[PDB]
Amino acid sequence: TTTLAFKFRHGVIVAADSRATAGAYIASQTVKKVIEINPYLLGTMAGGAADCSFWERLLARQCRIYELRNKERISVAAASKLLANMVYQYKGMGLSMGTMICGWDKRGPGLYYVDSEGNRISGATFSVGSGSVYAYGVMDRGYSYDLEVEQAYDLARRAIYQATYRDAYSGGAVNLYHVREDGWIRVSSDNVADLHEKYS
Amino acid sequence: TTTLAFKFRHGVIVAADSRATAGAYIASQTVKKVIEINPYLLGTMAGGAADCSFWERLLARQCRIYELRNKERISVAAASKLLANMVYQYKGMGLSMGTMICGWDKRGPGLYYVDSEGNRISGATFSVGSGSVYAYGVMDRGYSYDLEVEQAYDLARRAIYQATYRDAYSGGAVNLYHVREDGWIRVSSDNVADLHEKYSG
Amino acid sequence: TTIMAVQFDGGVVLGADSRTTTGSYIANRVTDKLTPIHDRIFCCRSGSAADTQAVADAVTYQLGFHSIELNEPPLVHTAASLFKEMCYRYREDLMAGIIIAGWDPQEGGQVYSVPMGGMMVRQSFAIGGSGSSYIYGYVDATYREGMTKEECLQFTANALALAMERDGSSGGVIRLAAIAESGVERQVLLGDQIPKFAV
Amino acid sequence: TTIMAVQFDGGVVLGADSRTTTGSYIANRVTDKLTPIHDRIFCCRSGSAADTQAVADAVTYQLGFHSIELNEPPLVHTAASLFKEMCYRYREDLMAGIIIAGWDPQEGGQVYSVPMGGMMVRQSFAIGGSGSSYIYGYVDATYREGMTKEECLQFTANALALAMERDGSSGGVIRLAAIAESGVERQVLLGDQIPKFAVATL
Amino acid sequence: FSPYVFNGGTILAIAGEDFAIVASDTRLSEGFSIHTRDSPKCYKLTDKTVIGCSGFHGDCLTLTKIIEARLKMYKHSNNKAMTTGAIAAMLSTILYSRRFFPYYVYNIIGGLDEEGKGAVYSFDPVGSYQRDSFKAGGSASAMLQPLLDNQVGFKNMQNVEHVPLSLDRAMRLVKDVFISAAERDVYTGDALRICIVTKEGIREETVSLRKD
Amino acid sequence: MEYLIGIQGPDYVLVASDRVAASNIVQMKDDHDKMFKMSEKILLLCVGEAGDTVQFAEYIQKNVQLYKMRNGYELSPTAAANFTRRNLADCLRSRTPYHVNLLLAGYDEHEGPALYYMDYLAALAKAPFAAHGYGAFLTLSILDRYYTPTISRERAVELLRKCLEELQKRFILNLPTFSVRIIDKNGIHDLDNISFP
Amino acid sequence: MEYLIGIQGPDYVLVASDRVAASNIVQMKDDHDKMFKMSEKILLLCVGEAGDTVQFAEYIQKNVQLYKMRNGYELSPTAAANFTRRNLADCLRSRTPYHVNLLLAGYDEHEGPALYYMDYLAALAKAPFAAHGYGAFLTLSILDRYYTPTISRERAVELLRKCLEELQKRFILNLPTFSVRIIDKNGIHDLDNISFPK
Amino acid sequence: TTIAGVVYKDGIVLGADTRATEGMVVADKNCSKIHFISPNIYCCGAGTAADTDMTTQLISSNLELHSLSTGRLPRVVTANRMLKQMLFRYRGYIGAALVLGGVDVTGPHLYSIYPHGSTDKLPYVTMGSGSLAAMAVFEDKFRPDMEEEEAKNLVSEAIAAGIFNDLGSGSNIDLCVISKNKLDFLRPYTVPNKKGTRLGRYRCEKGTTAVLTEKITPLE
Amino acid sequence: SIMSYNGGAVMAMKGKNCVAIAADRRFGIQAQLVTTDFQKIFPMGDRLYIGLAGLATDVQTVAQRLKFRLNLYELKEGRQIKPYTLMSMVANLLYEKRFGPYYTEPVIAGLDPKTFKPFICSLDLIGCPMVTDDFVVSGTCAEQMYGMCESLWEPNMDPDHLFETISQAMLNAVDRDAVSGMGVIVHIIEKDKITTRTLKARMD
Amino acid sequence: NPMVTGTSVLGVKFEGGVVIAADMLGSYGSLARFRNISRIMRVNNSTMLGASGDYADFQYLKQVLGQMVIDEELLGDGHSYSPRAIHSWLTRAMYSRRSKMNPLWNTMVIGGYADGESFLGYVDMLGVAYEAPSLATGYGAYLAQPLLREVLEKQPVLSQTEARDLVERCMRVLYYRDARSYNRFQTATVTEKGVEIEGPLSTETNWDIAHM
């Protein structure tokens, strides 16, 4: 798995791969790793899929309950706080989870990283999975805050491609999302074999 | 245990403590950890005393045979290489060793560090034992190639005392040595119960 | 430990040894392994003494409580079933062998052989303990239908003597009991009275 | 396994069963556990079969080679001591539990035991195997000094049978061999020839 | 002790424009022996949805009973039958319920979409599902999945036409694939059962294989 | 890894820590903050395991702020420290034990400044200076060499810089920038972070 | 762990390594050197356990110099690499196994430059660029992104520095100082160390 | 995996299966098991499938040497002794279960050997995973002093009952008969099961696989 | 395990008068690519080839020793070697190190230089050759190969159809294993010419 | 842990009714301790049961089932329990007690004669259940089932005498080749006339191969 996310002037961008393995046998190659929690939030899958789906569904339900009760969209900080305080009651059982919560609240964009151990932290560039190490190198050398939209897309795509080239437990297709002040949008879903020729 | 060593303009300085335990019981408090291999070289004890003594007495034997055969005194690098190669045969059997070879040759002063694993490296500042981390910090603030002998003596004393004040397996007396171009000499065997008064203690 | 029980026309006979070990050191050598449960119902203890004593005390309590309400003497199958339940519920007892002998007015002399675990069986003769293995064949060669009291007694004595000479965890005196309608007859064999063989 | 050996005035008698086992499955139900070593000396195997076969073969070779020189019938103590040494020098690699029996012109019939350790004892009768524990009390209450041949034969047969009912690792056919001065006589018992004891029923 | 077993029993499923197919072997094994040769692993829930399971048998049986008990509950409390997506979403939760003492079954569901199309759902013993077009879970997954992706996805084939699938073609393909995957796997054989879901209803077939 | 240090003066207190987070090969962040403000003149520096630090610190913070808004005044540091110690030793012998170390630098109007110490076993010592982490080995001695009870402010800052240089010279882990704060009779003050290019 | 990196080009070779020797909490030395010169146009870079490295390297250097002194010419990098692999695989199944990782940059007048790669199991691949250590995770992708076969000499150093700063941002270990060397048709050269202040 | 051997009036009959599995995936469907030891001796062998081949080759070589030196037909006792000793010398680290059998100047002879050095001289024996059902068939339908065309049917049935009932064995059936004037080696004797017919094709066209490079080398 | 520390896969098929042998191309350490031009197929004389899969060290060592022996063989007696003798040689070489063996699984494919008919063999860790008439495989992704080949391989095939089917099988197989792939190579042997080809695959 | 046990059990289904057979031995390891115990029960006028494994748990189940039958037969509602219901109840009990790590070491065989058709079941300790025309447990799964299958393939309908003969034939091979066995067994039949169990029997043997 390789999932990355970063924020800049015109909001946040998320990217992920589409492979799943069971040992050394490729089960499927068309997985959805960018979860659509709500029309204003987004998630991410890494580790166990059942967990990273169940708990995020519960989170979405709680967000909707809050919106109904208080008549105001919830914030990213409180959402990540909820998600962290939910799985902390299952410390030392076998749960594996690594997640990114992204959004835009009254004080601007927001990106938080969460995991099953308990460390919840903000930031501006994040990447997790078995191929995060290869993607950090490409994301750093190329990152900038005063960037355009037509370029961050290519940046994330190239990072994911170069991560799949070396890592064996990651490959398949590349999914990319972009969040804005209004809501998020699905911009593209490419294939690695169709990108290899685009480059050399 | 606690040993330190550092070289500068006026030669090399060596120092150690005088304690020996077996678990939590202090067996000895008058040990001599600066092995006098010869009137030209020096050693240091850390880890297992039996090994650090046997494998350096053998080294003395070999250096003497070398001097007899070749009519030329041996160097420091050759000594360290001999010791390392003779000790590498016993890798993974239970040997514990940490030592410093100090001396003077045609290439100037000389300080080398050796252990049983196999690593052999030169340097300009070394400390070994369960209290070397407390000594590094104070030797690093005060070290300078352009030092005077008295200030270097005081620095070594101070480092050893401060290391002793924190490490439980380190203490007793402070025996300071000094090596020059025409051999070495013993300097002092101060007691910690008396330095605590001279210093701010 | 060597326990044994045989059944004859009217009633039954029980026999046991008199040793208790704590490794290779004999902590007792006059022990009593024939525990009464009622007037004419007896149990034989094998295994850990703690568990056996506890279970036997509880069973005596239950029986005596349930024999004053009905105002009728109890049976042997009832006691055997109480033991079976109590030993199947807590299979961590390691109480192990109990052999249960008695006399009821409906049937006659009855013998039950509740082993390790919670199973129950009725047999004409039963044996148990570590030293029983060495006396199987002998019994299989000597049992015959139509025995009397003296014959059962001497047969039990001979079998026990033979088991005690070969096993190290059994020895001492031989305690015997004979049960029937008229009453209970207890006795012991020690020294020259014990049947001796040649070597 | 269950092997038994008895001694009378002018010779000896042997007895064994006919089962082999590798767990709860029977690989053979006729195996022969009486292995001759010389013209008038036998053996009785127990435990592992490979080790017993090897030891017996080597002893037979050594004893034949030692007898062809002296020009004299060997003795039983000789073979027993050879077995003793062979099983004591490898007591950490073997499981044999062997018995020896035979005849010789100096002393009459002789019996010896050799358990896994490497000992050597002679005795008026001997038994071995897993199913022996179940008969340690029957041979004691029936033995008597002054026994003839047929008496020993039927005694061994009965003991074997009684051991082959309660043990699961033994059973089948009962093989017997009688040794004396004139010569050897073998015999096999099966079916209605084996004894039977009525089962107890309430 | 060990509270699990291995019985085998590969499963296969396929979806089409207006039909769905679910195929299974027919045999039960334990170690190196054979218990029986008539034990299908395909079951019918409603008039437009079937399901197959493989792995530990007791769990399969009790899970089928559970699903059948809950469909009626839904029908009673809402006065309407349950769809396919709903059954998948319920199965995810039923499975995740035992996250620390899981089942050991690899489920697959086939049926008709809401309007008229064909739908397939592949699951895992923990409850992670995703909609797919063709799946061959089970013991012989590695033997069939690499094949269904060439003759049905047309991978690594250049200058090839799409020529969408049909009914008889898919049936014959399934037959040939299972006839070939019996001479190499030892847990699979002795018969083959097919259940087909169409606009009309649910139909069944039966074929015979070699007896080892 | 981790590093906390505290120094006490005659009329002030000076605390410092590192600001770094990592997952076994990589540092995710470089602007962390290991400090917590329990009140106007109390500071808790916690460190240790992953998800226990924030839980414990926020529990303590909530309870202290509640005491304040309930009674009418604040809580003295010598009291907050014992409260922390009691709660931690209690939760140590339960199903959810916390594995953390902490300092509780503070200031008071009656007794003056204060500096404390804990070792994840609920010890609660007290010293004129203290430190945590592996780095404590290479910077404690220095204090004992150059520290005086009547140490002024800038001299304490210089001693701190000295210890940090020693860390960056002999320590293997990077730890390039630190966060430092001071406490005085008027309150809390934040100083320019000690950074090394 | 340590760090070695190697790059090949059209008519040269570039190599770089770290200068740090530490014992489990403290860096005892900051002027180390992990390069062993086997010939006039051959280098060896060894990494791993404590004493096996030096022993193995000295053995190979002795035998190569012996070949040179005995025959009259030198060994080409291919022969030296296969010799190293053979000896290492032979010692793997013996009473004295060596745990080391290696690079064998070299140059020859017949077949041109060469940059090899060897694990502690004696596999002997061949690659245009390569790296060792944990830092190779945050470094290889950058090379894949920016490397091109007809690269120049100074652009190699630029890219090296590029992939070195990434280590002083994510890598937990300090690694402040590095050594760098180059090989071409004239022989080994030594360039300024790539140091970063602190 | 389903060996079997039997003795009859005037010789010996011997049979086995023809399948091999590397784990749980059928690697072969026609493998030979009845090996030749001497012109009148044949040895069928289960086990680790290499320890049993090397042993057989070695014993055959040594027996050929003995025959050439002596000047007459070998025997079975010699092979039994050789195998016994060579297997006992290794303390069981050689998995070489066999059902060696043959005929010599004396009557027929049938032995069974185990990896430790134990042997038997039974009249009918089995071996391998699937030996129990075959032994059951034997115990039920065996008689003494039988003829050829009865023993052949017996062995065939005994093998089929182990084929259709064990997951580790199934294929064509072999056979071998040894008398004083005959050495029938029937391979195959019968085929119980076969592959099913295909109901379609896959369109193996030409020119539908991409390529990046090509090379040609002409020969003479 | 230790065999799966590197990855790889090879296969062999028969034809009318021709034969084919294919292998993958990749070298990595348990999750990480290092290079893409690794060699697993080696010539053992004109019209005879052998492929290996497993621990790289051992394939290299086995190939070197095998050439060391084969050259001397051909030099003493002047004639090219036949496949059966090569199979037996390799089996002996493997069984020599029964304790402390080589972790490899060879596959041999070639012709007979007297009557140009095919031959293929598949050994194992130690031995037990499998002389078949349809096909053989060796590697970590063996189930995929056994499932793709069985469906294909009509009993008689010409060079073109043979190349096609073996290529399709190998491609659709290694695309289901993670520790093997990143390229493919194929060799076809006939009476008077040899063909070598590479394929267009997914480098992911 | 199991202490006293029993060996295999057989099962065959003929034209009208069903037959079962089982030995009499409560072995304790390698010792034949008890030799006149029955391992078969009569549940109803149309159902029976045989068990193999620990004897105490078999007794427990006997008690439970007897009390359940007595409880259902008191109402007098014209209803009754059928063999399939017994089968399913046993399956559920074993699965339940296994899911709590306190199982029952036992494998059971059920047989009965419903309205016009016979029934023959199987239950393991983990809950694995199924049906089949004839089956056996324990070591008998290797020595007995082959013969039964080879005879049912050529004619899958048999008369009562032709089934009893085959049973008496297969209970003779286990004595020859099973160690934990004895030469005493019971044979029971279920038909329309009800259940009927016979006395202890014996198997003629031949040892002619001992003289060669």
**Domain coordinates in residue numbering, chain D:** 1-202
| Domain membership of residue E181 as a residue range | 1-212
Tokens 């029955």, located at residue: J38
Chains H, I: CB contacts within 8 A come to 74
- C-alpha–C-alpha distance, residues A134 and A147, integer Å: 22
- C-alpha–C-alpha distance, residues B126 and J115, integer Å: 97
Tokens 């096609």, located at residue: I164
The residue ranges of DSSP E strands in chain A, in sequence order, are 2-8, 11-16, 20-22, 25-28, 98-105, 108-115, 125-129, 173-179, 184-191
Residues forming beta bridges with residue F183, ordered by sequence position: F13, F188
**Catalytic-role residue among C1, C2, C31, C52:** C1
User: 2.40.10.220, 3.90.950.10, 1.10.1270.20, 3.60.20.10: which CATH number matches C1-199?
Assistant: 3.60.20.10
Q: Which two tokens stand for residue H169?
A: 């064995």
Distance of CA A85 to the CA centre of its chain: 20
- Chain E, nearest residue to H28 by Cα: E184
Cis peptide before H144 (omega within 30 of 0): no
- Count of C-beta atoms within a 10 Å radius of residue H42: 24
* Whether the Cβ atoms of residue D152 and residue D8 lie closer than 8 Å to each other: yes
Alpha-carbon distance values, G26 to F26, F134, F171, F173, F196 (Å): 20, 10, 5, 9, 19
Give the DSSP letter string of J89-124: HHHHHHHHHHHTT----EEEE-EEE-SS-EEEEEE-
Torsion of CA E64, E69, E74, E76, to 10 degrees: 150
Cβ <8 Å between C135 and D133: no
Helix (H) or strand (E) holding F151: none
- Count of C-beta atoms within a 10 Å radius of residue C15: 26
Max Cα-Cα span within chain E: 57
User: Looking at this protein, which amino acid is placed at residue H79?
Assistant: A
The residue ranges of DSSP E strands in chain D, in sequence order, are 3-8, 11-16, 20-21, 26-28, 41-44, 98-102, 110-114, 121-122, 125-128, 174-179, 184-189
Q: Which residues of A are annotated as a binding site for bortezomib?
A: 49
Question: Do F and D count as touching (3 or more CB pairs closer than 8 A)?
Answer: no
The answer to whether residue A53 neighbours chain E at the CB level (below 8 Å) is: yes
Q: B85: distance to nearest CA of chain G, Å?
A: 9
Resolution for this experimental structure (Å): 3.1
- Count of C-beta atoms within a 10 Å radius of residue I13: 26
* Whether the Cβ atoms of residue I147 and residue E147 lie closer than 8 Å to each other: yes
Number of domains in chain F: 1
Q: E78: distance to nearest CA of chain H, Å?
A: 46
Residues of E with CB under 8 A from a CB of I: 140, 142-147, 149-150, 155-157, 176-177, 180-181, 183-184
Q: Which two tokens stand for residue G37?
A: 């010169």
All domains in chain A, ordered by first residue: 1-200 (3.60.20.10)
Give J-chain residues touching C121 at CB under 8 angstroms. Answer: 26, 34, 37
Closest CA to A99 of A74, A71, A118: A118
CATH number of H1-220: 3.60.20.10
Distance of CA H103 to the CA centre of its chain: 17
Closest CA to J112 of J33, J49, J165: J49
- C-alpha–C-alpha distance, residues A100 and I78, integer Å: 71
Chains D, J: CB contacts within 8 A come to 49
* Whether the Cβ atoms of residue H11 and residue H179 lie closer than 8 Å to each other: yes
- C-alpha–C-alpha distance, residues B119 and B87, integer Å: 11
- Chain E, nearest residue to I171 by Cα: E156
* Whether the Cβ atoms of residue A120 and residue A114 lie closer than 8 Å to each other: yes
| Domain membership of residue G178 as a residue range | 1-196
Q: How many CA atoms lie within 13 A of I116 on its CB side?
A: 12
Which of A51, A61, A90 best probes binding to E when mutated, by most E CB atoms within 10 angstroms? Answer: A51
- Count of C-beta atoms within a 10 Å radius of residue I18: 22
Q: Which fold has domain D1-202?
A: Glutamine Phosphoribosylpyrophosphate, subunit 1, domain 1 (3.60.20)
* Whether the Cβ atoms of residue I33 and residue A165 lie closer than 8 Å to each other: yes
What residue spans of chain B are helical by DSSP H? Answer: 49-70, 76-87, 133-139, 149-164, 192-198
Task: Give the domain CATH number at E4.
Answer: 3.60.20.10
* Whether the Cβ atoms of residue J88 and residue J119 lie closer than 8 Å to each other: no
* Whether the Cβ atoms of residue H112 and residue H127 lie closer than 8 Å to each other: yes
* Whether the Cβ atoms of residue E14 and residue E21 lie closer than 8 Å to each other: yes
Which of C81, C88, C119 best probes binding to J when mutated, by most J CB atoms within 10 angstroms? Answer: C119
- Chain B, nearest residue to G98 by Cα: B91
Which of D140, D144, D145, D155 best probes binding to C when mutated, by most C CB atoms within 10 angstroms? Answer: D140
The answer to whether residue B138 neighbours chain F at the CB level (below 8 Å) is: yes
Closest CA to I106 of I146, I67, I58: I58
Cβ <8 Å between A32 and E127: no
What residue spans of chain J are helical by DSSP H? Answer: 55-72, 83-99, 140-143, 145-154, 160-170, 173-177
Give D-chain residues touching H88 at CB under 8 angstroms. Answer: 50, 54
Question: Do D and B count as touching (3 or more CB pairs closer than 8 A)?
Answer: no
Experimental method: cryo-EM
Cβ <8 Å between E128 and A50: yes
- C-alpha–C-alpha distance, residues G114 and G116, integer Å: 6
Give E-chain residues touching I151 at CB under 8 angstroms. Answer: 147, 176-177, 180
Neighbours of chain I (3+ CB pairs under 8 A): A, E, G, H
Torsion of CA A3, A6, A11, A15, to 10 degrees: -20
Nearest-CB residue to I202 (from A21, A168, A193): A193
Number of domains in chain J: 1
Give G-chain residues touching A163 at CB under 8 angstroms. Answer: 141
Cβ <8 Å between H167 and E186: yes
Name the DSSP letter for residue J209.
Answer: G
Nearest-CB residue to J209 (from H123, H133, H164): H123
Burial tier of D193 (Cβ tally within 10 Å: 0-12, 13-18, 19+):
exposed
- C-alpha–C-alpha distance, residues F193 and F187, integer Å: 19
* Coil/strand/helix, residue J49: strand
| Domain membership of residue I7 as a residue range | 1-204
* Whether the Cβ atoms of residue A98 and residue A129 lie closer than 8 Å to each other: yes
The reply to whether B164 belongs to the active site is: no
Q: To 10 degrees, what angle do helices E167-180 and E141-151 make?
A: 150
- C-alpha–C-alpha distance, residues G102 and G49, integer Å: 12
Contacts of B37 (CB under 8 A, 6+ apart): B43, B56, B59, B60, B63
Number of domains in chain E: 1
Task: Give the domain CATH number at F98.
Answer: 3.60.20.10
The answer to whether residue B89 neighbours chain G at the CB level (below 8 Å) is: no
Max Cα-Cα span within chain I: 48
- Chain E, nearest residue to J101 by Cα: E3
